[PDB]
């Protein structure tokens, strides 16, 4: 086709309807489903699909034991038809690694896979199913990328990497690629002290990213990248309605340019649609672990250090395991504004369910309605006892 341009704004977000659910672990009890994690949803001009890091194993396979381990030569970024489980027979391996991101640019698709020793990691960039550019570790400490899709404006796809301490100050870089080649890269700027696992979306020629300040912040950092001038900046979501996990209990006035104190060196990947009054934050119900999942509408959540929920929608109940969550939109769909969407990683097995040696996930992805639709909870639905 032709390089896509984020020309429309966000649609009014009134509720959320289901979009897709793979039910992968339930179907995984009696089928050749693959152990995966860090999934995400991402579209082409012709189809949206499921993306996640496979573990080179089936759930019910003897190698699924140990799969709580994040990195190995055995992981691959794989994609599959929307709402189907990541089966052995139907998955397309995009590239090899233990960290990735991917996005269609209107003409073709760029997929990035990082892999290797912790202190010698590499970022190999593919473009139209061919490897094109290589980026070696700069701070020699777990080079990781988005674990979510990227966003492109006029062939330009900015991607945010991080290399260095999770526990402290690392070297985060926004790379700006075009057809597989770097156009430029620049040091994370603004007031975000640490940045990891960016959930990014585009609207009106500008990409925004709600990331995860792992170090000290319990409110998320935000990077707004201008794909045309090629400059970005960073800040924290002002709302007192905290969204990291673990996180402190909701205070009454937030902090806009500093990490929100309370819990350290830990968190989880989450997203958010900051669109003025059209603002919805996503979070785990518990402040203690990755369980539950809600979508709260906190108008001017980004700018207003005293913004509170005005409306809500429950996704996963507190009793059910949730996890990493991200954003994506079908930038090629018929319409006058972009319909925001998201997914929620629903993890089963280690560490919360130690009666099994595997860790794996299921996906449930939701999209905005302008209508006020009735809610339901979408759990993974697997009886862990069936696996013993």
């Amino acid at each position: 086709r032709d390089f896509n341009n984020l020309t429309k704004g966000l649609c009014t977000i009134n509720s959320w309807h289901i979009y897709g659910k793979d039910n992968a672990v339930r179907i995984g009890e009696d089928s050749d489903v693959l152990v995966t994690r860090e999934p995400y949803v991402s579209c082409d001009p012709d189809e949206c699909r499921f993306y996640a890091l496979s573990q080179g194993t089936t759930i019910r396979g003897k190698h699924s034991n140990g799969t709580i381990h994040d990195r190995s030569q055995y992981r691959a970024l794989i994609s599959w038809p929307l709402s189907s489980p990541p089966t052995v027979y139907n998955s397309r391996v995009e590239c090899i690694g233990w960290s990735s991101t991917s996005c269609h640019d209107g003409k073709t698709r760029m997929s990035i896979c990082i892999s290797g020793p912790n202190n010698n990691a590499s970022a190999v960039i593919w473009y139209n199913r061919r490897p094109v550019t290589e980026i070696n570790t700069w701070a020699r400490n777990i080079l990781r990328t988005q674990e979510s899709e990227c966003v492109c404006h006029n062939g330009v796809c900015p991607v945010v990497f991080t290399d260095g301490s999770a526990t402290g100050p690392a070297e985060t870089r926004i790379y700006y690629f075009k057809e597989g080649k770097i156009l430029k890269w620049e040091p994370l700027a603004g007031t975000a002290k640490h940045i990891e696992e960016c959930s990014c979306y585009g609207e009106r020629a500008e990409i925004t990213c709600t990331c995860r300040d792992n170090w000290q912040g319990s409110n998320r950092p935000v990077i707004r990248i201008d794909p045309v001038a090629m400059t970005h900046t960073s800040q924290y979501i002002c709302s007192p309605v905290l969204t990291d996990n673990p996180r402190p209990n909701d205070p009454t006035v937030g902090k806009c340019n500093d990490p929100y104190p309370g819990n350290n060196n830990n968190g989880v990947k989450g997203f958010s649609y900051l669109d003025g009054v059209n603002t919805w934050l996503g979070r785990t119900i518990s402040i203690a672990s990755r369980s539950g999942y809600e979508m709260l509408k906190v108008p001017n959540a980004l700018t207003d250090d005293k913004s509170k929920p005005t409306q809500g929608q429950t996704i996963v109940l507190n009793t059910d395991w949730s996890g990493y969550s991200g954003s994506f939109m079908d930038y090629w769909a018929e319409g006058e504004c972009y319909r925001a969407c998201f997914y929620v990683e629903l993890i089963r097995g280690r560490p919360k369910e130690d009666k099994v040696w595997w860790t794996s996930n299921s996906i449930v992805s939701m999209c905005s309605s302008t209508e006020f639709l009735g809610q339901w909870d979408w759990p993974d639905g697997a009886k862990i006892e069936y696996f013993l």
Partner: nanobody, 120 residues
């Protein structure tokens, strides 16, 4: 009303492992965070961890991570606690409390148990 029937005292030597009980009543055991405190003469009230009946979620004050192990019996509506490799430094009155905000982590410990003295 709500009630927390803890077990009786324990006398024991080092290296061992005592295992307490906290029997719930007067509420839906499944809808609340069961906390466990350690009032030590000299270290005051210290919080050990949480166990949630609904889904078996747990978390421990890092300090007591290796010593304590929380479990529960939804059947009998009873929370249990098990300290390992006892020492005189683990001698104290172990209390069990309920969450003020049910499944949430706030609202104070609205109901406690009468304690369960361990003596090493």
């Amino acid at each position: 009303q709500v009630q927390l029937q803890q077990s009786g005292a324990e006398l024991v030597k080092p290296g061992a492992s005592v295992r307490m009980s906290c029997k719930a009543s007067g509420y839906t055991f499944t809808n609340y965070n069961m906390y466990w405190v350690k009032q030590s003469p000299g270290q005051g009230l210290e919080w050990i961890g949480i166990f949630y009946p609904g889904n078996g979620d747990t978390s421990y004050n890092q300090k007591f991570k290796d010593k304590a192990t929380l479990t529960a019996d939804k059947s009998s509506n009873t929370a249990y606690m098990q300290l390992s490799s006892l020492t005189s430094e683990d001698s104290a009155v172990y209390y069990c409390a309920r969450s003020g905000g049910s499944y949430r982590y706030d609202g104070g410990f609205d109901y406690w148990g009468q304690g369960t003295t361990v003596t090493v």
